[PDB]
Amino acid sequence: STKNGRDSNPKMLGVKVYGGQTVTAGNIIVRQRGTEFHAGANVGMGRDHTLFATADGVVKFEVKGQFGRRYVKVET
Amino acid sequence: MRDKIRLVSSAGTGYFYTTTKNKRTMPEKMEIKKFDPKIRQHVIFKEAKIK
RNA sequence: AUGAAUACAUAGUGUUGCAAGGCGAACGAGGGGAAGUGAAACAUCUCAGUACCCUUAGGAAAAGAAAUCAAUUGAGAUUCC
RNA sequence: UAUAAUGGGUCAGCGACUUAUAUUCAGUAGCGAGGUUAACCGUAUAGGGGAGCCGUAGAGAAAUCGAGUCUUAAUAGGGCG
RNA sequence: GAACCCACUGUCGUUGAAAAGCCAGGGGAUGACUUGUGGAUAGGGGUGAAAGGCUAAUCAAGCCUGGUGAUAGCUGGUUCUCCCCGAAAGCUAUUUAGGUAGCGCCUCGGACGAAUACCAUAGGGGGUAGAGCACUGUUUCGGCACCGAUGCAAACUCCGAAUACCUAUGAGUACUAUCCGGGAGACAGACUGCGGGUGCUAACGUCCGUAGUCAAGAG
RNA sequence: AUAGCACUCUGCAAACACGAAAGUGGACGUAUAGGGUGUGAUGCCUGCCCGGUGCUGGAAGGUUAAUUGAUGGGGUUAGCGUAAGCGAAGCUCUUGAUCGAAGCCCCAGUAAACGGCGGCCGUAACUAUAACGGUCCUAAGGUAGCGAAAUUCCUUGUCGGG
RNA sequence: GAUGCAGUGUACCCGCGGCUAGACGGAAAGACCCCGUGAACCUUUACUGCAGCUUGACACUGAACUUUGAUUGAGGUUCUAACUCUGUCCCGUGAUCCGGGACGAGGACCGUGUCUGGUGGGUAGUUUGACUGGGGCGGUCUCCUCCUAAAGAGUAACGGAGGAGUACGAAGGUGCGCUCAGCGUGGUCGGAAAUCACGCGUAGAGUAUAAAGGCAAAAGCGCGCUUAACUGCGAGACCCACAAGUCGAGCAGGUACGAAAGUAGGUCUUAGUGAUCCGGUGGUUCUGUAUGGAAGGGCCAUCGCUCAACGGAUAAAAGGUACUCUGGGGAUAACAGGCUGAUACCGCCCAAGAGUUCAUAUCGACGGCGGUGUUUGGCACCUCGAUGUCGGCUCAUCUCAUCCUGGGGCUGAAGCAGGUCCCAAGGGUAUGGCUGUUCGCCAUUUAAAGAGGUACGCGAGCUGGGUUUAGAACGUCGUGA
RNA sequence: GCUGGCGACCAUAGCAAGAGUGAACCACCUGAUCCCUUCCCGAACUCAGAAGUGAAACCUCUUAGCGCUGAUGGUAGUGUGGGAUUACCCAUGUGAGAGUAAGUCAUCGCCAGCU
RNA sequence: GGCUAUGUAGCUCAGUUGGUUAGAGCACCGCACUCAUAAUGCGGGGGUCACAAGUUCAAGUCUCGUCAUAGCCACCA
């Protein structure tokens, strides 16, 4: 007999809205286990590190700061 | 194991919350300030049996 | 009419007269009463008071004239659609 | 599946998606904000019979309201309309 | 040891002379013996010196008629003609695994038209192929745990494509997308190429992803 | 199956069996008889274990049924109350004090009742073995007799005869 | 596993007597094996009933004395009149039934009805999971993390590795504040390693717990005050068969910490879980079977499942069948065939060494490359509306990797013999003891007693000793079948 | 031309080494009365000030010493079509990582104060 | 769930509702007795009377709870 044979259900993480797309306030942009992306202007952060839009506009990805963090923001 | 308890409003409205507690480390009866919606004020809630 | 234990009687016994028994379709009334099956298994439940067994009427039978319903204080025996 | 997997020796005759009720959808006909009778009566497919059913209002567990209603302290928000 | 009652061995017979026999041998043969006639025991019952034996050529529950047209997610079968479209063998759940239900895929009616697709530009995230040793492990040879040369990795990464995927604009081409209803079937797949797990880099093996063909397609 | 053996039940309206009952067999019998169970002429014999299950005999402590119904808590309303509310009696819903048998738990006996009958390590003057000894657990650890057997995997065990 | 397909060889048309190698020949919808939420019968400390047996209460059921327990209970002794007699006598009556009468022996017992506890395979109805490279045994069944997974999501195997069925009133909120680990120097016990001081390069520390993704405004670590581990919601999205699950700005009320802008709807996140039914508890401006109440019900909050076979068939369930049976499957096992060749057998390459010296007369280590289709296996493609046998007998046919006989090369070949390799398939190639044996051991022969294929050739050609139905026994296993 | 504050950007920008500045600013500095502070300490935080210094620290300059950036060309991989099956070849499109040449001791915005 | 009964040295049984003012028997070690031994006799050590609280002038001894164990009974989401 084998001692293996277990796995967990999928979690369907990932980028939901890509750069250049138009969003409405409340739209989820990124599902992520940790902060692979950080929240920029007009973007909020949930309790499970989800990134969501807090205004209507156009999504933009960038890299900024002294730590080289990846940021996502919404331009109005 | 943690046991389930009720926290009952002292205002007499009968409103109550439910929670758990470790009886080994908290033998005394819980008392905590909480919001009572029947009177819309914060009052003291006291431990009672889950029943 | 006759006639014990047993004294009166009674039981018992005999004669005459009258009546009944049996058969046959379905329907009626009453006494008993399954399981296959369904529940996607199965025991509560269902099948179903069905199948079957038994007793016994009539042209029909059963029921029937409120110790019944109703809820503006009203209806007015039973049976069938 | 030529299969060395099944069935048929041959002919003639028979042999398997039905019937009743309810419901939903489509077509067609009558009438149309209305439509339609059932049991029953009836020298009887006619004509009577409007009890009842469907449509015309929704919300709420319900009392209740009603183009609104429920939730709520809320005329906010939101759900069914 | 004859009659009578049995049935140990062998050949024959096996669409037999016979649905249990013939023939040659065999056992008991005054006894717990054999046999006629007439009776008793009736089906979860009878009877059994006991084999689940026998109970009318029928016995781990006789036969007949009723319940009854029992139920069968199983097997078989399902009858004249022409025209149009045309699948699936997947996901999820199931005392579920050869059944079924919702979704995916087919068809028909209605609504609505450019909201759709192909391709070209433009915007976007990645951690695979490859590669590398900066982390985690592992490896060889030197020097004094470090230092220098040198390899390796599905569960290592300082790096990192091609494709694929999402969005916007646009030319041309195409009866395209979408919504509301009636009817389904199907939920046993197979081989081949490419990327893999498993196996022996075995199998016309087995399990996934992806494309073609068969299935349901002749030449 | 059997003659023989043993255990056990049965005092007669017997135990036991058939039957719904009436009744019938047992038996027109009476413990030298009748039923059930196992063993199986005869010879020699038949060891240990009552912890388990069963059976037999005790015991009156714990637990427990119906029945009984003490208390406590509610519903209703005459009345009292400005009102809030309080609220007898009578009906009524509920609660269950006390009493309460067998059985079970407990104690003995019983194996020709169903059943059971162990392990580890050492020791005598060469070598071997152990009359012998230490230790653990059981209710007890197989007596007589027999043994590659209708029982023995290894196995065609080894030796002897043919 | 082909009379019917391809290529090719052979073959004028038709009987009769024989024969059984094939027509996977005929016969019986396989009995072995698996499956169906099939059947029957049997067993039991499976579940649930019932008969039977048994206990007590009430009834049939009465009268007198007495003794004793905590007003009541219990016990004892007498009696007759209910009731019993499968005891005697008389009568109906020509009668061992029955009925009535008279005695005698018992007697409020026994016994029967209703209720009630116990016992109850005697009897009855049933249950006894699924996945599975056949089934059984073993393992597994829900959730989280990584890889497989092919740079969006998703993606299987009885594939490779680990965790969960919790914890915390602070380990939550807030304001303020602080940086780890290791190493080198010095310094009482005190050192490898305790605490103190100063420096060097450094996130290698920590984050309640497994892993991953994260963590300087630190999400890591302290202190003070505190309860936002609130109530009503909620634009908009993620995920998705359904049922469910996830994120969420913002509005209103009350609140905590801040001077304030503000932050707070539990904890860095992702596991720590269970639908419906049935009931319990706290509230409630709902309902209330004539009316007023009430009982009951509804609504809001909350409680009870290792229902772990984790979408949970019942409140409640184990086994045997060789005494067996039905519906099905070559969807799925045992035989033979097929694919494959791990294993098996045979051959070759290199060559340390052995051979007094001398790798190669004869052997040949450590390693490497193939062939065959005999063995043990892997797979499950054909056959379950049947391809029906281990050995012996009878009769065979083919291959050559040759046992004998024939022809050769080398030799550590003097001769006789032997060793090794090459060519060669024409013919030939034991009888018995033991055992069911094939095989094997043994005895005695022969020039030799070869190795294999042919459904492990051959049972519509024979047998039937073994295996594998129904009877019976022993050892062993089980309470038992 | 220097000094301070707040930003853009996040190594061609950093690290290391050497050098320089006190008029103003900054820094060290004096003290512990009052405000406030140490799980002890006026070290930090805080308050009251100017006797000193540019030592330390911060800033500015120089250096390719570590680090960082980095072509061209070639190689690996790869979509489509074709040919082969140890997994390569051809046509076409695309194209790393490493290494080589080489580069780098940053570049900008607002406000205020001095000379 | 309900009703009961227990838990005392190295090993065992008492002590059981107030002034418990925890002892008895075997294990040991030492001493004595003996020509040498026992048995026996003596001494010492070896628990802190299931735990946590309550009343009280008296608590292992009683009342409340929390453990472990045993006996009977009851369990239809």
From Swiss-Prot, chain A:
GO CC terms of this entry: cytosolic large ribosomal subunit
Record's keyword annotation contains Ribonucleoprotein: yes
InterPro entries noted in UniProt: Ribosomal_bL27, Ribosomal_bL27_CS
Any one biological process term the GO annotation gives: translation
Residue ranges, annotated region (Disordered): 1-12
Keyword Ribosomal protein: yes
Highest taxon of the lineage: Bacteria
One GO MF term: structural constituent of ribosome
Keyword entries, A-Z: Ribonucleoprotein, Ribosomal protein
PANTHER family the record matches: LARGE RIBOSOMAL SUBUNIT PROTEIN BL27M (PTHR15893:SF0), RIBOSOMAL PROTEIN L27 (PTHR15893)
NCBIfam families the UniProt entry points to: L27
Xref: HAMAP family: Ribosomal_bL27
Recorded family membership: Belongs to the bacterial ribosomal protein bL27 family.
The protein, known as: Large ribosomal subunit protein bL27
Organism encoding this protein: Acinetobacter baumannii (strain AB0057)
Designated gene of the protein: rpmA
